[PDB]
Structure formats: C-alpha cells, structure tokens
Amino acid sequence: SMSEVERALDVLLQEAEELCIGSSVVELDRIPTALEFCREFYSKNQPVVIRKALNWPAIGKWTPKYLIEALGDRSVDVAITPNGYADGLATQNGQEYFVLPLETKMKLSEVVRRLDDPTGAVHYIQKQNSDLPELAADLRVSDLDFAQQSFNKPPDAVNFWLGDERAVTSMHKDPYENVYCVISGHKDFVLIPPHQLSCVPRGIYPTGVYKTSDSGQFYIEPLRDEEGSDQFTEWVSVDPLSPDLAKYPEYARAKPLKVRVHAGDILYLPNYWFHHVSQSHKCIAVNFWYDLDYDSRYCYYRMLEQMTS
Amino acid sequence: MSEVERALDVLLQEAEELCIGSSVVELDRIPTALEFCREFYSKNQPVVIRKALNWPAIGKWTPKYLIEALGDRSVDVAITPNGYADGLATQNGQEYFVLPLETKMKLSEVVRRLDDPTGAVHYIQKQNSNLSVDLPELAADLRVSDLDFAQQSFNKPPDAVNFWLGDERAVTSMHKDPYENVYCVISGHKDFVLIPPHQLSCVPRGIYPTGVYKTSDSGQFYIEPLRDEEGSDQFTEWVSVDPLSPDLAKYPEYARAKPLKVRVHAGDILYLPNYWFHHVSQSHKCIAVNFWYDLDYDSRYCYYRMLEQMTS
Numbered sequence: 212s213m214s215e216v217e218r219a220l221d222v223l224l225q226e227a228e229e230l231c232i233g234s235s236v237v238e239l240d241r242i243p244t245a246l247e248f249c250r251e252f253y254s255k256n257q258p259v260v261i262r263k264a265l266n267w268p269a270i271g272k273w274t275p276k277y278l279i280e281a282l283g284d285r286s287v288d289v290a291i292t293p294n295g296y297a298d299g300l301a302t303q304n305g306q307e308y309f310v311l312p313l314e315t316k317m318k319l320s321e322v323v324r325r326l327d328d329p330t331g332a333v334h335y336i337q338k339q340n341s342d343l344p345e346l347a348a349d350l351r352v353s354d355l356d357f358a359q360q361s362f363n364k365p366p367d368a369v370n371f372w373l374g375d376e377r378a379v380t381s382m383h384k385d386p387y388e389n390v391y392c393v394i395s396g397h398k399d400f401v402l403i404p405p406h407q408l409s410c411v412p413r414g415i416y417p418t419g420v421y422k423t424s425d426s427g428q429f430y431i432e433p434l435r436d437e438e439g440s441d442q443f444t445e446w447v448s449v450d451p452l453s454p455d456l457a458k459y460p461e462y463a464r465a466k467p468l469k470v471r472v473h474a475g476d477i478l479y480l481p482n483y484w485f486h487h488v489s490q491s492h493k494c495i496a497v498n499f500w501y502d503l504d505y506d507s508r509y510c511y512y513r514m515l516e517q518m519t520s
Numbered sequence: 521m522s523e524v525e526r527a528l529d530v531l532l533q534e535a536e537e538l539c540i541g542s543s544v545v546e547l548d549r550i551p552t553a554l555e556f557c558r559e560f561y562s563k564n565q566p567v568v569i570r571k572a573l574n575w576p577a578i579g580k581w582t583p584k585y586l587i588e589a590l591g592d593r594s595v596d597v598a599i600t601p602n603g604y605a606d607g608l609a610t611q612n613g614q615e616y617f618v619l620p621l622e623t624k625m626k627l628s629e630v631v632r633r634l635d636d637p638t639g640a641v642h643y644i645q646k647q648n649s650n651l652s653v654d655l656p657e658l659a660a661d662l663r664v665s666d667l668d669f670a671q672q673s674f675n676k677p678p679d680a681v682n683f684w685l686g687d688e689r690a691v692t693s694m695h696k697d698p699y700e701n702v703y704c705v706i707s708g709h710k711d712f713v714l715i716p717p718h719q720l721s722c723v724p725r726g727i728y729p730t731g732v733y734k735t736s737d738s739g740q741f742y743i744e745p746l747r748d749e750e751g752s753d754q755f756t757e758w759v760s761v762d763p764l765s766p767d768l769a770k771y772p773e774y775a776r777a778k779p780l781k782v783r784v785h786a787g788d789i790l791y792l793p794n795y796w797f798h799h800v801s802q803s804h805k806c807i808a809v810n811f812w813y814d815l816d817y818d819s820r821y822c823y824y825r826m827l828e829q830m831t832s
C-alpha cells in the first residue's frame with residue numbers, strides 16, 4: 212500500500228486517465244477564431260498545432276546566407292556547449308551538475324562557419340527581442356491575433372532561434388503561454404502535461420557554467436552565491452528520448468506526446484507544460500512568450516509541486 | 521502539520537495572495553462572447569451583470585398573471601416545516617439530511633399558501649428542467665438568445681431550464697452542482713453566499729442519515745428516516761455549516777473560508793461557475809429561472825477530485 216500524499220496523487224492520475232486529459236496534441240488545418248482558441252485550448256490548458264498556418268515572407272527568404280546578406284553580418288550573442296545540452300545535466304568528477312551555456316559573442320558568418328563543423332562544439336543562437344525593423348518586416352505578427360486576444364496582453368518576449376542539430380533542450384517548464392512558429396526546418400517537441408508532475412523524476416543539482424581554458428578544452432565551473440557556498444537548482448532527471456524505467460519506475464505512468472513542427476506551422480504550448488526540444492540542422496524559429504494570467508489551476512499546480520517535492 | 525495539511529496550506533496561500541475566487545465581478549453591460557470566455561468561464565469566476573435583461577417576463581410575471589396564463593393548472597410543490605428543503609434538521613437527538621414533502625396542487629392553491637405567514641413553507645423548486653418540461657407556454661416571455669454571450673463558451677444547449685417560485689422562509693442550504701449556471705431573476709431578489717471549489721478544505725462536510733418530511737393524520741410534520749428492509753440508514757454527504765451563523769468553535773476550519781455575498785435583482789444575470797458552493801435565500805414570492813449546462817472537463821476537475829480525497 213501507499214502513503215496519504217500518494218493516495219491523493221493516485222486519485223489525480225486516475226481521474227485524469229479516465230478523462231484523457233492532455234492525451235493528444237490537437238491538429239488543425241486552419242487558424243481558429245479568437246473565441247474557438249479561448250474555449251478549446253487556452254481555457255483547457257491544451258496544446259494545439261496548426262499545419263501550414265503561416266505564409267510569411269520569412270518562410271522562403273530566411274537562411275543563414277540571406278540573414279548574413281541582410282543583417283550586415285553583425286556580431287551576435289551565441290551559446291556554446293561541448294555536449295549540446297545548454298541548460299542541461301552533465302557529469303564531472305563523478306558529480307552531476309546542471310550546466311548553463313558558455314555565452315559569448317561572434318560574427319554571424321563565423322557562427323555559420325562553426326555550424327557546419329561536426330567535429331567542433333555545439334552552438335545555438337537565442338536572441339531575446341521585443342536591421343531589426345527590416346527583420347520584423349518579414350513577419351506578419353498580426354496572424355497571431357487569434358491567440359493574443361485570449362491572453363489580452365502584448366508579447367512579453369519574442370525570441371529568435373538558429374541552431375545546430377546537436378543542440379538538444381532538456382525537459383523543462385515555463386511560466387508562459389508560448390506561441391511557436393517554425394521558419395526553416397522542423398522542431399521536435401516531447402510534451403508532458405502539468406498534472407503528471409508526480410511521474411516526472413526531478414532532482415536537486417549543483418549549478419555550473421561551461422568554461423574554456425587556455426587550451427580551449429571545456430570544463431564545468433561551480434556557481435556560488437553572494438559570498439559563501441554553492442548554488443543549486445531543481446531539474447528533470449529523466450531523459451525523454453531514452454527513459455531509464457528501472458532507475459525511474461514512476462516515469463512509466465507518464466504519457467509523453469510527440470509533435471513535429473514544420474516550416475509554416477504554429478504550436479501553442481500552454482503554460483507549465485513540460486517540453487523537450489530537438490530540431491533539424493540550421494532550423495530557424497521565432498516564438499512569442501506571454502505572461503500567464505493566474506487562475507485556480509496554477510494554485511493546484513503549486514500544491515502539486517509541494518506534494519511531490 | 522502533516523504533508524497533506526502542508527499542501528493544502530500552499531493551495532490556500534497561493535489562491536488568497538493571487539485574488540483567486542476572491543470576489544464577484546460586477547458588470548453594468550453584457551460582455552462579448554470572447555470577454556466572457558476569457559475573463560469568467562476560463563477562470564471559473566462568478567460574475568453578476570446588472571439590468572441585463574428586458575424580457576417580457578420581468579414586467580408581467582406575478583402570482584396572478586401566472587394563474588391566468590397557465591389556466592390554474594396543478595404543479596409540483598416542495599413543502600417543509602422549517603424552510604430547509606434538502607437541508608439539515610434535528611429530531612430526537614439526531615441530525616438528518618431531509619428531503620422535502622413533495623405534492624401536487626393548483627397554482628392558485630400554492631399562492632394561497634404563500635400568503636399564510638403561519639403555514640408550512642411552500643416552494644416550486646422541482647428543477648429537473650421543470651420550465652421546459654411542465655411550463656412551455658411561459659417560454660414565449662423569455663429570450664434565451666440573449667444568453668448567447670455565455671452559451672458560446674459552453675458550446676452546448678442548456679441541459680436544464682428551471683423555474684423557481686418560493687416563500688421568503690424557503691432557504692437552500694449550501695451545496696455544489698456539476699453545472700455551469702446562468703441565473704436570471706424575474707421578480708424580487710435572490711441572495712447568494714458563494715465559496716470557491718479550492719476552499720473545499722475550509723467547508724466542513726458530514727455523512728448524515730437521510731430522511732423525508734411527512735405529516736401525521738393530525739397534520740403534524742415529522743421526519744421519517746429513509747431505511748431499507750434491513751433497518752440501515754441511507755446516508756448523504758452534506759455541508760455541515762450554516763453560512764448565516766457559522767459555529768467556529770465546532771468548525772474552526774471555516775475560519776479560513778471567505779464567503780462571497782451577492783444579491784441578484786430582477787433583470788440581473790449571475791454566472792455561477794461549476795462546482796462553486798452556493799447557499800440561496802430569496803424575497804417573498806421571488807420568481808427566477810436558470811439555465812444549467814454540462815461542464816467541459818479539464819484538469820481542474822481532477823485537482824478537485826484530488827482535493828476531495830485529501831480531505832476525507
């Protein structure tokens with residue numbers, strides 16, 4: 212038999228199984244109305260993927276070469292890793308850390324050159340925007356009103372991504388509503404619903420950052436507080452691509468959803484959904500992050516965090 | 521405190537600090553379907569809209585006009601001695617959950633009994649879609665299309681439409697319904713006390729023998745316990761507290777609860793979201809109608825079932 216907290220958790224999971232909560236990513240051929248989106252997806256905290264939804268100029272024009280021609284081969288901020296796991300788990304001297312990317316700057320064409328070398332380190336570009344007007348002129352952001360009218364606030368962030376196939380984003384959650392638009396290539400998402408939290412292994416790890424030495428080899432440097440001892444972070448311990456079900460029995464009761472998002476597709480990723488992200492080589496994407504509007508679901512989720520701490 | 525009580529403390533802290541289910545929103549104008557979906561339905565948040573309806577009914581529906589328009593036909597009426605149909609009452613040392621005495625009588629007969637201050641409490645409260653079922657001719661004095669602003673968020677027709685006409689002594693004890701509720705007062709006013717689902721742990725609940733009101737040959741009311749052949753009580757889980765006069769010594773947990781009071785006048789619309797606890801009083805001969813819609817399941821319902829397991 213099981214504990215009191217575990218009886219409560221089991222009731223949650225059984226009720227959500229019977230009702231098939233978060234059991235499928237809805238597939239749409241056409242952009243829904245603002246009301247359809249509010250009713251069927253936003254208010255139900257439910258992912259949706261809209262196929263061939265966008266006809267943006269970008270979708271054709273945008274490549275690394277065209278971006279170099281357009282942006283004037285500017286200097287950008289790029290994240291670098293030895294293993295391709297920025298914000299991810301890595302071992303050193305037998306200790307598993309949560310490591311942050313080595314963040315540096317370089318010329319866009321140099322980034323492109325370093326993307327074509329399989330032998331080198333893994334690079335990805337994540338630009339946190341709000342030349343740049345020229346780039347914004349290749350996008351019809353109004354096409355996303357159907358979703359924005361549900362959130363009733365402007366994008367709190369608009370990110371541009373250009374990255375290596377080797378760049379894998381490990382499973383994590385975000386306090387945002389997320390509208391994701393692939394421009395070039397395809398992005399693979401693995402999604403787990405919030406309420407399955409108790410089936411997702413999480414641990415506490417010393418946090419570090421990747422650094423190069425004089426010789427150019429990578430190591431992990433522990434991160435430390437204002438003055439004194441180490442810093443920690445809580446992070447998903449399981450690998451969705453190859454779950455070790457022996458080490459993590461409970462993960463077998465989870466139900467991950469797999470969705471591939473192609474150029475011209477839209478993916479609504481609701482707030483606090485677990486996701487793991489892969490992509491094709493030199494995939495380009497832009498996504499819009501909206502601050503969430505707190506409802507009782509968030510409070511239940513905080514409670515669930517407390518129960519499964 | 522235990523792990524479960526710690527988790528419940530988290531739930532209540534976050535909800536209180538984020539102003540979740542913390543008030544009834546007043547509007548003077550009917551929202552748009554999108555506004556209603558975003559601000560009230562998707563948030564499971566109650567809202568009252570003042571002077572929202574201009575139905576013919578709001579002018580004309582009285583005891584007399586209903587006696588005339590319905591040809592003084594016979595109707596279902598719930599009767600109690602204390603005014604608590606489907607409520608708790610004590611007898612011979614035992615607290616029972618009591619079902620009302622249900623009978624049929626002429627509409628004019630009911631009106632005569634509402635005019636008796638000393639009589640038993642009468643209430644036309646059958647619900648189970650008694651307006652569409654038993655009173656179709658009244659439907660022409662309403663305009664259900666005016667509720668489209670909310671109906672589009674439910675995306676299904678009303679699964680029930682109820683008609684209420686009761687005594688000021690007829691009080692409905694606190695309970696929850698598996699429905700989205702659109703409440704339209706026609707005459708008089710209705711007083712609601714509301715508590716959000718996530719405060720379930722602040723609401724005491726008990727298992728009670730079930731009974732039903734009966735009269736003796738002399739006309740005295742009494743509770744008859746409901747039992748099967750074996751002599752065993754059939755039980756009902758019910759809210760134990762009286763929102764009007766809470767007994768915080770008996771029920772300390774109700775201290776952390778925050779009831780919301782709202783009076784709904786003729787022409788006002790109240791949206792009572794699914795599984796919201798509600799207690800209902802009314803003015804004398806208040807007339808109301810309301811529309812029940814089956815709820816659309818999401819993870820909140822699973823969390824509420826977990827909350828019920830956590831507090832039993």
Ligand SMILES: O=C(O)c1ccnc(C(=O)O)c1
Nearest residue numbers: 372380385389391488496498
């Ligand atoms: O595209 C990504 O690599 C990525 C990484 C982390 N987060 C997100 C997101 O859409 O939230 C996307």
Ligand SMILES: O=C(O)c1ccnc(C(=O)O)c1
Nearest residue numbers: 684692697701703800808810
């Ligand atoms: O108006 C009432 O008396 C009443 C009683 C019980 N329930 C409801 C309801 O609208 O759910 C209304």
Ligand SMILES: [Mn+2]
Nearest residue numbers: 383384385486
């Ligand atoms: Mn993310």
Ligand SMILES: [Mn+2]
Nearest residue numbers: 695696697798
């Ligand atoms: Mn009710």
